From a paper:
Here, we present the structural and functional elucidation of CPR-C4, a hypothetical protein from the genome of a thermophilic Candidate Phyla Radiation organism, identified through metagenomic sequencing. Furthermore, detailed structural and sequence alignment analysis enabled identification of a noncanonical cysteine-histidine-leucine(carbonyl) catalytic triad.
To assess the effect of the non-native His6-tag, crystallization was also subsequently conducted using protein without the tag, resulting in a third crystal form in space group P212121 and improved resolution (2.25 Å), with one dimer per asymmetric unit. However, the absence of other metal cations in the zinc-free crystal structures implies this is not a promiscuous site, and the tetrahedral ligand arrangement is strongly preferable for Zn2+ binding over other transition metal cations or the sodium and potassium present in the buffers used.
Residue numbers in the entry:
A (entry chain BBB): -5 to 38, 44 to 216
B (entry chain AAA): -5 to 39, 45 to 215
Write the structure that this text describes.
Amino acid sequence: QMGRGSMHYKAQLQKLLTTEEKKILARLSTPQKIQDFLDTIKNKEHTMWSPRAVLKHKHAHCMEGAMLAALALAYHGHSPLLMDLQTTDEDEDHVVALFKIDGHWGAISKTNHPVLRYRDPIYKSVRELAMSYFHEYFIWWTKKNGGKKTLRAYSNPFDLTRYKPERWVIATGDLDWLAEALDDSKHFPILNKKMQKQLRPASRIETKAASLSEWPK
Amino acid sequence: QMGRGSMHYKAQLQKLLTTEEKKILARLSTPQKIQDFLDTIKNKDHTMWSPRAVLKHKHAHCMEGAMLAALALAYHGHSPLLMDLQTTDEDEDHVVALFKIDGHWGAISKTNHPVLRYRDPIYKSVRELAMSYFHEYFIWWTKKNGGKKTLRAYSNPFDLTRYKPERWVIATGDLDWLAEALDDSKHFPILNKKMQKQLRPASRIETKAASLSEWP
């Protein structure tokens, strides 16, 4: 199956996890199965729960969802990769878990709205995948700059392998240092100042569509 | 500063158009102003009207919208470019009008739903722009293959300059031959058979959101 580094990394994860947690991760053996699992978790004070906490309470915001996805991907031999989607100060950033199948990038995403969703493994580069989010990242919750497109940059794939898995997989603290390290990593701008002046606000039908909610119900 | 070919093409268009038609096209001097204008046209639920018919009756499906956009782009010196988005037989193709500003591709689009919309001129290649549509091209109107992602290929930019402008700008016929020529042009596949087997259906929240209607 997987390489030496991956099998070693999986072994370190198995030392930290309970039999129940491993039985769950063993079932999530494709990126599609992982997204299906996050679909059963209730979408979200302030928190930054570990994958352990998320599996216990079955509640997650986008980075909590992406860290659990990255864990499940690593348990089946993928790199635990996050990508930050970074907006203007008018909006909140969004995090996904990147994956590759046959040389093509996909993304697992935990969101409550019909935008910034899952991406199939069909995108030839990180850039191409990231640009598939741009048009649907906009102000939908106020008339003030209604429809303004707010995405400005995407991170390099952020490999959680650089940290001891104890520090995030089963942490009882808040992992704000991990969020901060992601936000501080290499990002690539999507626009220059000229391109920003060209931007057209999303239509009323688009802001109405974006406002629909998965949770509750 | 507009080129010789473009000025000549614009001259041919001016011979064919009424003063009212030219007054409209003169106003639509940016891609954004064109999309704003298509927003005031009623979306349709077979026809294949000319830009003349669309300006007269203020009604358009996607290719009628894109042909009017391409005309308005050409009236200000852009190439009148169409891109075909080609689906499985479970769905209908969608056509946009391509444009470039400072080396980056955008797209003008006439649709009734909050998917397959306008694209800002920020995309580094036709491929990159086309791939920005893939995830939001799915079956939302039936439970039969509910949520199936149906996009399979995108055309090369289709330059309408190859035809005598009389043939489409002011045609009174149906332009089924023009639709057929677009569908027959070079297309680039997005998937192979392996990748198609990977595809995941769109969620219920996505199919509900896609179902929303601008018109009536």
